[PDB]
RNA sequence: UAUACGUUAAGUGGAAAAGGAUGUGGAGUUGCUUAGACAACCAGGAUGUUGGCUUAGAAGCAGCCACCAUUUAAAGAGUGC
RNA sequence: UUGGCACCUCGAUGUCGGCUCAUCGCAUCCUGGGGCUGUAGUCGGUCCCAAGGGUUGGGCUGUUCGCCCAUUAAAGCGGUA
């Protein structure tokens, strides 16, 4: 939580810093206009009453020492520079937000965790080098239609189950929302009873346990996106409003 | 070496095969006007090529006009040539020949007529 | 003076305004004249030549579109290859090769259809297109 | 900055650079190489300077094959010190070179490019050199 | 001038010559103008 | 103030390097070359095309990739400004 | 310069700084003459030739050096036990 909170405040710093160097488009448009009007212009002038290609009339300042060519090129240069810095800040934003979402899913998992997956999560983070110092993957209980629904509170074990423990046409059931675990039955194609029973297991281990308005997303594993870690997108999906449940979900 | 030998050989070949040919300068004109001439003679089916004076002479004897810049136009023609000349007027139309009969400037003009 | 201008779009100022502001002629009346002649596929980047005598006697000539334009319309693509001969990403048909050939026969030097085709094939090599 | 991982003796005599080389007198890994015309000690900083120089000139070019390795260490006492009181501490690492010895090679690249790169490297090196190619 | 012992041509139009026993470089570009010393 | 043969011309001789250079002497290899070379002078030095990508713009020449075909005697999808 | 070695000097070669007195080199601070310039001008930068002459007075500190004030065309770097 310290790291996630830190990253959130980090991007807050970056965002409120970003609001003070955003003069790119002005310089772009100025360079455009100057290159368009590079024949009416003296070298030594301060200003330029110029029309935009809505036919306003803009007065662009100049360097009275420079040529219009030099001046317009300087505007293009500043556009280039602001463009570069904004690209940098946006990349840092993307990094920080990826990390924050990673840790948010991680905290969801840790909330809906078992020790067997916590032992894996520790090694996952030591691998991520936030920390320092083999087939058991999934955990299941009873389900509707006398079925078995497997899950993993660990991101790594969840991915292992989603990839190596089922096919493409099988169904994955998870949150239709921000953060929750990932779980499914082996070739999850059972009845609507099991479809609604999986929603209870989803809402139990979620970002908001005991939340009585949590929608679960059920989608074919064939559209499970294996794109940080556990940044899994989904398609071929439907969604159903559901709620948490008791240990009868077992 | 033998390459130049082959070259003069085929030049004499196409020479003796033709029975109308014209000998002109290519100087003081751009590649655009040149290729204009080339295209109108392509559709005229009148061949036109560019050779060196020395090897050209060797092919002929295998005369005075053969010096200086010299391109050649075979019709196995003079009309299109003189038309281009009246158009542009930076040329020499120095010589011609027909059936091996050396044609004068006025004579190639008359064939153009 | 050459200008690469879409047909129906005349007086999108910033490229073209300078193109004649040195000449000092009426930019916009000329532009709408250009549209009037080029009542064509808007976006078809026509090569238009312009020649102004010193007294402002301007006369302009529209011409066939570029090879890259015709080939990108053929393949329905936006861009040629960023690294042709390392990543070919486009393809069109020999029939279309014939078509663009027969189109721009009037302008080229090559009296031969097939030689004009070879020219377009070199263009296709340059822009990352294969032929089928 | 090359280094021998492990060594018996961190301190050696310096030695004597008499005569010509034993081996490595002709390019055989690559095509266009460089050889020496003198004898001298050469350092890891020198060789890496030359290496990065040619690779910057070439920018993707083929293969290099350095033909040496600075096995020898060299000592240097600290500053402003009298003589004696043991041998000085090691400082760096050195390769010893005889004349007739090939230092750098090149393959995958044309002759002019190779000659220019090796020129650039020679100017980073102390000694007199010659451009060479495979027979 | 650019006095220096490493005298070379820079561009193709730079032309080395010798003068009073000294080596010099000529070019229309005066920044390419050199001499040994 | 020898003889013969050559070398150097810097006072080298009579102080020293990396490196640089149409310095000269001696050989040796090799390309082109009176079917006419090198230099110079005259002329041309083009078309798809502004090659495409990137770029606000990159039009032979910021940069990435490619570098083909046509007129062709030849003109590079380009050597330098 | 800091130093290394111990070659003259321990039957004595007085050692920092300052004063007076100058003198030499030039890798020139100014003055003189030029090239290049990212030298418009004025001012400059850098490099080349030039050692003829000139190259300040004070506060603090024993000081050298250095900082500071105010000037100057400039307030040179060093050798001479």
Curated annotation (Swiss-Prot), chain B:
Keyword rRNA-binding annotated: yes
GO biological process, one term: translation
GO CC term (a single one): cytosolic large ribosomal subunit
Name recorded for this polypeptide: Large ribosomal subunit protein uL10
Quaternary structure note: Part of the ribosomal stalk of the 50S ribosomal subunit. The N-terminus interacts with L11 and 23S rRNA to form the base of the stalk. The C-terminus forms an elongated spine to which L12 dimers bind in a sequential fashion forming a pentameric L10(L12)2(L12)2 complex.
Job of this protein: Forms part of the ribosomal stalk, playing a central role in the interaction of the ribosome with GTP-bound translation factors (such as IF-2, EF-Tu, EF-G and RF3).
MF terms (GO), sorted A to Z: large ribosomal subunit rRNA binding; structural constituent of ribosome
Family note: Belongs to the universal ribosomal protein uL10 family.
Residue spans crossing the bilayer: none
Originating organism: Bacillus subtilis (strain 168)
Keyword annotations from UniProtKB, A to Z: Ribonucleoprotein, Ribosomal protein, RNA-binding, rRNA-binding, Stress response
Upregulating conditions: In response to low temperature and salt stress.
UniProtKB/Swiss-Prot annotation, chain C:
MF GO annotations: large ribosomal subunit rRNA binding; structural constituent of ribosome
InterPro entries: Ribosomal_uL11 (IPR000911), Ribosomal_uL11_bac-typ (IPR006519), Ribosomal_uL11_C (IPR020783), Ribosomal_uL11_C_sf (IPR036769), Ribosomal_uL11_CS (IPR020785), Ribosomal_uL11_N (IPR020784), Ribosomal_uL11_N_sf (IPR036796)
Keywords: Antibiotic resistance, Methylation, Ribonucleoprotein, Ribosomal protein, RNA-binding, rRNA-binding
An annotated GO BP: translation
SMART domains linked to this entry: RL11 (SM00649)
Domain of life from the UniProt record: Bacteria
Traits of the deletion mutant: Depletion gives a strong growth defect, a ssrA deletion and rplK depletion is synthetically lethal. RqcH is no longer recruited to 50S ribosomes, no change in RqcP recruitment.
GO cellular component: cytosolic large ribosomal subunit
UniProt PTM: One or more lysine residues are methylated.
UniProt-listed SUPFAM superfamilies: Ribosomal L11/L12e N-terminal domain, Ribosomal protein L11, C-terminal domain
Pfam families in UniProt: Ribosomal_L11, Ribosomal_L11_N
Annotated Gene3D superfamilies: Ribosomal protein L11, C-terminal domain, Ribosomal protein L11/L12, N-terminal domain
Any further remark recorded for this protein: An unidentified mutation in this gene gives rise to thiostrepton resistance.
Annotated function: Forms part of the ribosomal stalk which helps the ribosome interact with GTP-bound translation factors. Required to recruit RqcH, which is part of the ribosome quality control system (RQC), to stalled 50S ribosomal subunits.
PANTHER family on file: 60S RIBOSOMAL PROTEIN L12, LARGE RIBOSOMAL SUBUNIT PROTEIN UL11M
Gene: rplK
Curated annotation (Swiss-Prot), chain D:
Listed NCBIfam families: rplP_bact
Organism: Bacillus subtilis (strain 168)
Family named by the database record: Belongs to the universal ribosomal protein uL16 family.
Record-given protein name: Large ribosomal subunit protein uL16
Keywords: Ribonucleoprotein, Ribosomal protein, RNA-binding, rRNA-binding, tRNA-binding
Entries under Pfam families matching the protein: Ribosomal_L16
One Gene Ontology molecular-function label: tRNA binding
Keyword Protease annotated: no
Gene of this entry: rplP
Role, per record: Binds 23S rRNA and is also seen to make contacts with the A and possibly P site tRNAs.
From Swiss-Prot, chain E:
Gene Ontology annotations for the cellular component aspect, listed alphabetically: cytoplasm; ribonucleoprotein complex; ribosome
Keyword Zinc-finger (UniProt): no
Domain of life: Bacteria
An MF annotation (GO) of this entry: structural constituent of ribosome
GO biological process, one term: translation
Keyword Ribonucleoprotein part of the UniProt annotation: yes
Keywords: Ribonucleoprotein, Ribosomal protein
Pfam family, one: Ribosomal_L36
Family per record: Belongs to the bacterial ribosomal protein bL36 family.
Record's subunit section: Part of the 50S ribosomal subunit.
PANTHER family, sorted: 50S RIBOSOMAL PROTEIN L36, CHLOROPLASTIC, LARGE RIBOSOMAL SUBUNIT PROTEIN BL36C
Name this protein carries in UniProt: Large ribosomal subunit protein bL36
Organism: Bacillus subtilis (strain 168)
């Amino acid at each position: 939580v310290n790291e996630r909170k830190k990253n959130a405040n980090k991007i807050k710093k970056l965002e409120k810093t970003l609001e003070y160097s955003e003069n790119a488009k002005e310089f772009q448009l100025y360079g455009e206009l100057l290159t368009a009007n590079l024949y009416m212009l003296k070298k030594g002038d301060k200003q330029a009453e110029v029309i935009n290609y809505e036919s306003p009339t803009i007065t662009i300042p100049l360097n009275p020492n420079k040529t219009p060519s030099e001046n317009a090129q300087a505007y293009f240069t500043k556009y280039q520079k602001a463009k570069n810095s904004v690209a940098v800040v946006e990349e840092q934003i993307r990094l920080a937000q990826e990390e924050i979402e990673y840790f948010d899913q991680l905290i969801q998992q840790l909330s809906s965790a078992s020790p067997r997956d916590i032992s894996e999560i520790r090694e996952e983070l030591v691998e991520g080098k936030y920390l320092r110092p083999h087939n058991p993957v999934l955990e299941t209980y009873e389900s509707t239609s006398g079925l078995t629904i497997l899950v993993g509170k660990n991101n790594r074990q969840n991915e292992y189950l989603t990839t190596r423990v089922a096919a493409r046409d099988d169904i994955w059931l998870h949150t239709k929302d921000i953060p929750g675990s990932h779980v499914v039955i082996r070739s999850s194609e059972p009845d609507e009873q099991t479809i609604m029973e999986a929603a209870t297991i989803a809402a139990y281990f979620s970002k908001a346990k005991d939340s009585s308005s949590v929608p679960v997303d059920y989608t074919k594993i064939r559209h499970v996106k294996k794109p940080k870690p556990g940044f899994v997108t989904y398609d071929s999906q439907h969604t159903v409003f559901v709620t948490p449940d008791a240990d009868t979900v077992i | 070496i033998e390459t130049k030998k082959v070259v003069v050989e085929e030049i004499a070949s196409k020479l003796k095969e033709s029975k109308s040919t014209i000998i002109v300068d290519y100087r003081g004109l751009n590649v655009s006007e040149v290729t204009e001439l080339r295209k109108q003679l392509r559709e005229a089916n009148v061949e036109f090529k560019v050779y060196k004076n020395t090897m050209t002479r060797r092919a002929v004897e295998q005369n005075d006009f053969l010096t200086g810049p010299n391109a050649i136009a075979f019709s196995t023609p003079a009309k299109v040539l003189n038309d281009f000349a009246k158009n542009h007027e930076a040329l020499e139309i120095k010589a011609g020949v027909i059936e091996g009969k050396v044609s004068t400037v006025e004579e190639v003009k008359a064939l153009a007529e | 003076v050459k200008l690469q201008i879409p047909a129906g779009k005349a007086n999108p100022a910033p490229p073209v305004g300078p193109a004649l502001g040195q000449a000092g002629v009426n930019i916009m009346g000329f532009c709408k004249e250009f549209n009037a002649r080029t009542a064509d596929q808007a976006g078809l980047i026509i090569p238009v030549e312009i020649s102004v005598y010193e007294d402002r006697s301007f006369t302009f000539i529209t011409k066939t579109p570029p090879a890259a334009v015709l080939l990108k319309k053929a393949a329905g693509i936006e861009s040629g290859s960023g690294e042709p001969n390392r990543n070919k990403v486009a393809t069109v048909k020999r029939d279309k090769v014939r078509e663009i050939a027969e189109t721009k026969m009037p302008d080229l030097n090559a009296a031969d259809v097939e030689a004009a085709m070879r020219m377009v094939e070199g263009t296709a090599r340059s822009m990352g297109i294969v032929i089928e | 900055m090359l280094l021998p991982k492990r060594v018996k003796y961190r301190r050696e005599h310096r030695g004597k650079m008499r005569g010509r080389a034993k081996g490595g007198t002709e390019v055989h890994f690559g095509e266009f190489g460089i050889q020496a015309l003198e004898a001298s000690w050469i350092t890891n900083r020198q060789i890496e300077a030359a290496r990065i120089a040619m690779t910057r000139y070439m920018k993707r070019g083929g293969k290099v094959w350095i033909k040496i390795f600075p096995s020898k260490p060299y000592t240097a006492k600290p500053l402003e010190v009298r003589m004696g009181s043991g041998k000085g501490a090691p400082e760096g690492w050195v390769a010893v070179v005889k004349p007739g010895k090939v230092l750098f090679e090149i393959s995958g690249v044309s002759e002019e490019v190779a000659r220019e790169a090796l020129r650039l490297a020679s100017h980073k090196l102390p000694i007199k050199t010659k451009f060479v190619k495979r027979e | 001038m650019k006095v220096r012992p490493s005298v070379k041509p820079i561009c193709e139009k730079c032309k080395v010559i010798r003068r009073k026993g000294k080596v010099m470089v000529i070019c229309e570009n005066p920044k390419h103008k050199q001499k040994q010393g």
